[PDB]
A and B are shown apart, each in its own frame.
Chain A
């Protein structure tokens, strides 16, 4: 259950930043690969040119706040996003 609160476009960088909430009552925090796949499938994104900046769970709440980015191209990805995030997301 993904509800996207905000989508904003940055032409100066060339990326779409998405702020969303995952509503998972009675279920663990969704895995990064599951969240990426669901977001890419629903929003029609390029899976090799998008990362999940963070997923945060706040105390006894079943709603986790997720922030993700989708760059225009792999060149912008390697230019802006750093090495540790690239290893974590497995796009390099």
Chain B
């Protein structure tokens, strides 16, 4: 249902706008962590983030997951497919799939891919 699809897209957008960036504890304190922003579970005996105290950064949990129907979709609503040539481009569904050209593809092949996508009616996320 298109109405349910749109409602779940809005729900996912709001949820992921509210979601914070889960980062390792004391990431800001050292360049060795600030230059490599990741999340690591705090495991110390006296770790406040492990204790989940208020006033401290939160931790990832299963509840933050997107609704199943629109999980992983492009914000435009299409499903991204990574394409490396015209043969892979021609296998997409123009009604519900979008093409993302691989970063490694050169200009000579990208021109042909873009032309084929335009004449097939397939959306391209990164047109050159």
Residues of A at the B interface (CB closer than 8 Å) are 3, 5, 21, 23, 25-26, 60
Query: How many angstroms between the C-alpha atoms of A16 and B72 in the bound complex?
Result: 35
Chain A contact residues, majority secondary structure: strand
Query: How many angstroms between the C-alpha atoms of A23 and B1 in the bound complex?
Result: 12
| Cβ–Cβ < 8 Å partners of A25 in chain B | 5, 69
| Cβ–Cβ < 8 Å partners of A60 in chain B | 68, 71-72
Chain B contact residues, majority secondary structure: loop
Query: How many angstroms between the C-alpha atoms of A60 and B65 in the bound complex?
Result: 13
| Cβ–Cβ < 8 Å partners of A21 in chain B | 93
The 5 residue pairs across chains A and B that have the minimum distance between CB atoms: A25-B69, A60-B71, A3-B93, A60-B68, A26-B69
| Cβ–Cβ < 8 Å partners of B68 in chain A | 60
Chain A residue at minimum C-beta to C-beta distance from B96: A23
Of the residues A5, A23, A26, contact of B91 by C-beta under 8 Å: A5
